[PDB]
Amino acid sequence: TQPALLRLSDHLLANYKKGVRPVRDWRKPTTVSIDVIMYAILNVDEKNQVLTTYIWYRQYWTDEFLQWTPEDFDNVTKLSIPTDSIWVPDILINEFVDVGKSPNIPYVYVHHRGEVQNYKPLQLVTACSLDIYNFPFDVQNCSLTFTSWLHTIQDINITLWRSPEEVRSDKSIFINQGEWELLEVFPQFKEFSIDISNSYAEMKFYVIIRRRPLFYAVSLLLPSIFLMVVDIVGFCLPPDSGERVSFKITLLLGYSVFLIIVSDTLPATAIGTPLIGVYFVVCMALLVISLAETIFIVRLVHKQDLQRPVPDWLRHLVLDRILAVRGLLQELSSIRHFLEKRDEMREVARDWLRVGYVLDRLLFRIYLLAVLAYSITLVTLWSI
Amino acid sequence: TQPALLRLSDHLLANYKKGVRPVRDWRKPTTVSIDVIMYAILNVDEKNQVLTTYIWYRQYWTDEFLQWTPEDFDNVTKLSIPTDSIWVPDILINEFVDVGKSPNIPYVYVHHRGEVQNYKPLQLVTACSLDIYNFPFDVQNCSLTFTSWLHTIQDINITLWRSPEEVRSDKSIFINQGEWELLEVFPQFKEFSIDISNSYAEMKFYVIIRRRPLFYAVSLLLPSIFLMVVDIVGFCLPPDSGERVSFKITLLLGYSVFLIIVSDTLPATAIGTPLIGVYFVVCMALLVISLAETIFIVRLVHKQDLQRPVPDWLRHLVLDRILAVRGLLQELSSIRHFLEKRDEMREVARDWLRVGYVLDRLLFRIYLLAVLAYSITLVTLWSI
Amino acid sequence: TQPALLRLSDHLLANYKKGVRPVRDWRKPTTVSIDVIMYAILNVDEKNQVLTTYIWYRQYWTDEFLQWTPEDFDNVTKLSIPTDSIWVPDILINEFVDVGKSPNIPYVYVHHRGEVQNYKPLQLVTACSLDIYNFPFDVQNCSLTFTSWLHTIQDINITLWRSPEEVRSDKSIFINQGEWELLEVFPQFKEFSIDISNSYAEMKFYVIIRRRPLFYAVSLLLPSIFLMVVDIVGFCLPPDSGERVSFKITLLLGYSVFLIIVSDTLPATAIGTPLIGVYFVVCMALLVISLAETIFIVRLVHKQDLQRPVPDWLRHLVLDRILAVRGLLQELSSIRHFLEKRDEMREVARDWLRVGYVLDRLLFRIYLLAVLAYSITLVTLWSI
Amino acid sequence: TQPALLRLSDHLLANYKKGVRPVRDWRKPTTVSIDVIMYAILNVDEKNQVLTTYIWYRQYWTDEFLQWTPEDFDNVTKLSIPTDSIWVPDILINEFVDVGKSPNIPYVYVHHRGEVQNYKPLQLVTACSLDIYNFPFDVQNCSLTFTSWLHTIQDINITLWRSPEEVRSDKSIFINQGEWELLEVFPQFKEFSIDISNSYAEMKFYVIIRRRPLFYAVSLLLPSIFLMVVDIVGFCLPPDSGERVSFKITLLLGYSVFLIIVSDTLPATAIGTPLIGVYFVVCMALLVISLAETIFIVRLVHKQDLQRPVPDWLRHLVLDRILAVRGLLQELSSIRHFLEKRDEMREVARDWLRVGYVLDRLLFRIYLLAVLAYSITLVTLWSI
Amino acid sequence: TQPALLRLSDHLLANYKKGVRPVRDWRKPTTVSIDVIMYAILNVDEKNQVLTTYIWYRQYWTDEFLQWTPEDFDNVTKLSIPTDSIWVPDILINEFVDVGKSPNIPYVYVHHRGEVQNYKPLQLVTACSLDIYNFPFDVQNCSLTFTSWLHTIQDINITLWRSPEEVRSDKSIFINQGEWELLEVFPQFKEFSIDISNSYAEMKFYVIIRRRPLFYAVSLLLPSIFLMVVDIVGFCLPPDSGERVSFKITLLLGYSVFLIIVSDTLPATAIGTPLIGVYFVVCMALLVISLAETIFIVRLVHKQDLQRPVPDWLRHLVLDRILAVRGLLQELSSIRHFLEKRDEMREVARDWLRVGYVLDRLLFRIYLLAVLAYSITLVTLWSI
Ligand SMILES: O=C1c2cccc3c2[C@H](CCC3)CN1[C@@H]1CN2CCC1CC2
Numbered sequence A, B, C, D, E: 001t002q003p004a005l006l007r008l009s010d011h012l013l014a015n016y017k018k019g020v021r022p023v024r025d026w027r028k029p030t031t032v033s034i035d036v037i038m039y040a041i042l043n044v045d046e047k048n049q050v051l052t053t054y055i056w057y058r059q060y061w062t063d064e065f066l067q068w069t070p071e072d073f074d075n076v077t078k079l080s081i082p083t084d085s086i087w088v089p090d091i092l093i094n095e096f097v098d099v100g101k102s103p104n105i106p107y108v109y110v111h112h113r114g115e116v117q118n119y120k121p122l123q124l125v126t127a128c129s130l131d132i133y134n135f136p137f138d139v140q141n142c143s144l145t146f147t148s149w150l151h152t153i154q155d156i157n158i159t160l161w162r163s164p165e166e167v168r169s170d171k172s173i174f175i176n177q178g179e180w181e182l183l184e185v186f187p188q189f190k191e192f193s194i195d196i197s198n199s200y201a202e203m204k205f206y207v208i209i210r211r212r213p214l215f216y217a218v219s220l221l222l223p224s225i226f227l228m229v230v231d232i233v234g235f236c237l238p239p240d241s242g243e244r245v246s247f248k249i250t251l252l253l254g255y256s257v258f259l260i261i262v263s264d265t266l267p268a269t270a271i272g273t274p275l276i277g278v279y280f281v282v283c284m285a286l287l288v289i290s291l292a293e294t295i296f297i298v299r300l301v302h303k304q305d306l307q308r309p310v311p312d313w314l315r316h317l318v319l320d321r322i323l324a325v326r327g328l329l330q331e332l333s334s335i336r337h338f339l340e341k342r343d344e345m346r347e348v349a350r351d352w353l354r355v356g357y358v359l360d361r362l363l364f365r366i367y368l369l370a371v372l373a374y375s376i377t378l379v380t381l382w383s384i
């Protein structure tokens, strides 16, 4: 006349101790099977070398104290028991560095032969060793080691619920619209021993993830291209205009402030720097070379009033690779000498300015070729 | 002589087990009805793809162990029972990524036929997939899936307390002065099965929200308009003044620093970039074209002392589309030749400067027409 | 021979149920009186529309199960009982969006007729609708609604312990050295009904606060005044010096970077923008007008070698509102003609420069008058 | 035959009620002695007016229900009892605004006459009123008020364990390498009464701390000195070089960006601003005066072709405080007149430039004297 | 017929008190052995002087109430007991300033002679005194003091489980890819006494860590080298070009903004500043000296029309260490005098410009030598 569930709960949970490992022969370990499904990757901190994920975790073990015959209890083959009323193994990850706030599941399933099932979502704060050598295109290899913190392998052994193929090829619920992309989850069993007669069992899950580089394209490639374009645009100013130096120094200031602003989002580890810093400093070196060429050309064509005539070797190479009446007379001769001195100085300045113009055009063509070579090399290395 | 409430509490909560599903026949599921009301949208994080809301949640189910006759207990038809004294279903959202700090409601209502009522406010930290293609005007479509985490559909089935129309058209308490605007909450029932004989029941609520674009108008449209205005103002400087290049390069530096400052508040997802980046780079391309035109006009009108007379075709097109006495004599002739050379060089420079002025006016008119076309196109696309 | 307190505790807390509403007749509600005192305003977030306060809260109700005669228990008229041993009503605020960490008070006072007293400090995280139209001088009007989350008005009714005058005029412990100033706390009772036969009681407290504007004076008024001063200082540079344009563009760049830096501390709501943005854009428009006037005056006085003589109407208005011997002869005449051409061009340039100087002085006086008018209008609007 | 500790624990904790104030005569209060030792000052927030400290707190009271004779229990004079098994007073600070995460001490000492001892470390989040008028050198005066939150003075009275001298002169464990320096902790007892017959006891501890100014020397004094030095360096540029104005405006831009960058680390309260802002605006006013002097000197020495001869009073003061033959003849006379006009204009320009040079040297000496006076005044005010 | 584990649990945990120190003779202390292994260093905050680590902690003590004979209980020599069922000592660190979220280990091992084992991971928030005098290369010396917070040395004494050599030379699990490198963990025992007859036992662990300097190389050495390079590049501009001053002032502005940007990542303590600030201000002083030299050379070579001939001593040193006919006649003489005056002024300007060029080359060579000396000194101090 009982509801056939109160009867079973009173038959099971009475005279039951939740501190004893549920075995009738203490020489047998409780094999705890484990299954893990990745759901989301909340935050990957490259500075502190931590990893915040969120998984759906579930275990199975045999409780030799929760067993009954269904025909006695109205063919009841399973029921739900509160989690704080039975023995639960202490399986937790070795690579913890904090505690994740996870919802509390208060019930567990129990079958008529002792098979307990415990579904529980977990938020993991794992200390992973991150390598950012190829920053925009890197494949991180983090590990999760499920082990019993106190019991040896003669008490709790850890197996896998599903086959390793199904665990590796499972992306059914992963939030894929984020920054990271899940490649696989590779499980592996290992008997880790600290001493003799003290061997622990553990199950390592290798979470292999890959970053999406288009998150940083608009933030890394656009300003450099824009600055190189405005540089090759400003390279067409006349060298004697007195504004090319200001243009180049303002451009270098802008590139410097952009570099020191974007260096914050760029991660950094104490072991090494990403390979993009080399390309950034190569671009800034190209800008500095452009500035130095501008300064040299300005130093050439400047009218300093100390200019001597251009040497003949340089001329060849560059410009082929490109009485009262007597008193009146002497006064007029002095005036003509003054005017001729002025005209000769102007002609020397003109010759120097033409030489400078030719050299500037040559160096501009060389710089353009070098920039195009560097750009096509970068494009090929991106496209391979 | 008892207070008629102590009697009922002792009659109900004695011999009561809070771990057993309250059914007299285990072949019947406990239908849990659900009602949800949105109250506030605390934070929408487009970077980590999370959503923090705050709802008012309430459920109803039938407890076949809490039943009495009112006439026996002084016509008491309902009372309040502590929540930790009865069976509560484990209904929680599938899309959790954290735990929200919510107040604890310690009591529940119970009627004389078993109908339990459980009001409880919840703070949800939900992993939603956000699409920001149309950033200032986007309609996000997030989902909340209420399901039983352990019980199958033969134990706990989920229904709706109100009709779907009332759930869709309910905005009675929503905090509307924020950044997001609630459009509707659309419920839908689905029997989600992982395997055969293992089918779970769930209730999906589609929270459809829309961002208010005036939050970002004063921060996105004002600086671009101001910079375009000062650009068309500075376009009136004389090209031979030697300050137009400095003006344009300072303006481009200011636009660049504004761009890299405002790019932080602009969100970004690893799948795509918003459509406002295209308009921003089009504006910066217009600025770069203005700079290039200024540089070209400066290169034309510069007095380089190497200037040859302007060709006749260009002239036509542009400027129509717009003895002691003999010794004294030869000395005076040399002086006159010097002066005539100077005057001829000045005249050539004047002709080139006039050609440059005409071309500058033409290109300024063209640039103004292009800017007005782009502005009216943007205004129409905003106003449609 | 007992300590006369153990006796009373055993007489009261034995056969006592902490889940039953303490009434002998279930047709009577437990009138819970409420008193609230503001202590501090921790943080007002205008972006997320939340409000973090800290109050001293206390309630009073009648427990008909905790009653005794003092003469029996050695004239004991009151004692302290742990809070987890009696019935406590579930009074909490409707406008919660989080949980505040508040100290736990473990004891309550009980008198010999059932009057229980429960002092408890609370930290509130309340969702308030903030209006920042007059940002530096605004009077926020936030609300706190104390209501029973589950019980109707036939079970728990809410009254006020003190008179509304004393609750409105109480600032005894408020931390007044902060940014916000408390004006009053106005209570109001309302019977809020969702349906028929389901009416809830609630008590609304309107916390009316006012911001102190001197917190932002040194951060908002000082840079604008400094920039206007340096602008009217730089307005005295000669227009033909070739540095006035650089001065004005550097000043505009500085004002722009200051604007985009201070726009972060300036709050913003999706419904509207504060009225200070209008004054800021008016100041930046004044700066842009100064830049345009400088550009115009520079365009006037520039020596372009294309300058024609100033028209007579403009002149009037502005400048009144302010043989071998024959061969020698012809050679000397040609020289004199060259010199006369140069002198005539210089004279035309001088006339244009004088006209430009006069117009610059006139426009500078006009701009100074306009700036003084705008400043005195702002001062009057602040002082009223 | 018992371990002589199980016996005593069963003799004490049996028939013991942890909710009753441990007195045999309810007309006697439980005098709780208090001792406090500062350990660290974690964070002082001048914006929100909070203070986060960490103290070592300990109390002593007499429990008249925990008493025994040592000779009966094998000369046991003291033992440890779990804290959740006895009565603990509710002593907490009045100035709380949050809850501090502190370790939990599970045991307390009890002597054979009832003296209980309760050591416990506490993290305090206290609302302190901060005065930052003298920001780099300020002595904050914060208060901690230990009082019983519910019990009046007839139930719990608060005394001091050590003498006030030892509490004032105790710096044994204070972390001294931080930013703040502890001066003293001054205790004071006060009987605070809200009404008649309702008087509470409290113990106020005045934590008097002092900031170390060398934390901000390298961040406040270095850039101002550097900018003043580069200003007095750039003051030596020739006034007619056309670069002094650019130098001064770039320097003012740099000082402005430094000011608006360092104004963030500078705290600010709604009641007043620190006294360092006055010195900062005095320095910026000196820079603006230098800019105005440069502009004036530039306006003096500029060659505008409108220059009239320098007036004689200014000259005195400044420069003492520092036929075919007839046709040929008339043509030569016209040429000589042109040349003489040019030479006269050049001579007038030279005179004006010399006057400007003299005035510039005089004003530079005056500015240097003023800067040295201001610097020595600041040094003396720092050194007193 | 019992499972031989339920029997042992009922034999042990029945009649067991978890509040009594497990000794049969109260005159014997419970020697608690301790072992500590560092696992990760999460965050070192130099501003607030805190240290966040994560260790693997384990203790051992003898429980004289948990003892049995294996042959009686089926040769069971050990089992797991819940932690909340036995007596656990209150060993915690003295240098706490917060509470670290650590996983909860619910079981402990117990042998058949009372040896209990308690493994537990801990997250420590320790107040450490940090010295950053040699910021990029510093060896921090932090301390962890494990002591019993309440029990004296006659109740709980603390020993070491492993030998001090094994504790010092253990780096088996340390996360080494981070910013800090673990050198050793040196334990030391000390009997700390506050009074007479009140002596406590404690165990100090000196965690000695060292920072990796390559984390800050790319952020500290690169911009300074780049700016020095562009400075020595710009040092080649002609001094009379009128752009060298603009170049130098723009470079100084860039260096200043870089300095004030990187000064944030540079830590700072109230006791002293790191030694890198001296080198940074030496570099900025070199830049200021370059600016002053540029200003001096510009002041020398400027054509001011007030230039007097260069003195002979300076010349030697520098330039060796490097009637109608009569009317026509007088008119021609006046013209020649004008031209000769102009030519003489030009010649004086040329002489001054040559002197300035020579001095500029000399000072540039001196500055280059000084820069190379400073760079090689820095390189040697880094390489030693
Ligand atoms: O929980 C809820 C709630 C949740 C879900 C749906 C609905 C509600 C009611 C309103 C009806 C629809 C309001 N509430 C509150 C609970 N208490 C009584 C009325 C409200 C304020 C306090």
Ligand SMILES: O=C1c2cccc3c2[C@H](CCC3)CN1[C@@H]1CN2CCC1CC2
Pocket: C035, C036, C037, C056, C057, C058, C119, C120, D094, D147, D148, D149, D150, D194, D200
């Ligand atoms: O809670 C409260 C409180 C709350 C609401 C209203 C009022 C109060 C009293 C003052 C009277 C009005 C102060 N308090 C404190 C509680 N204890 C005794 C006096 C105060 C300090 C400790």
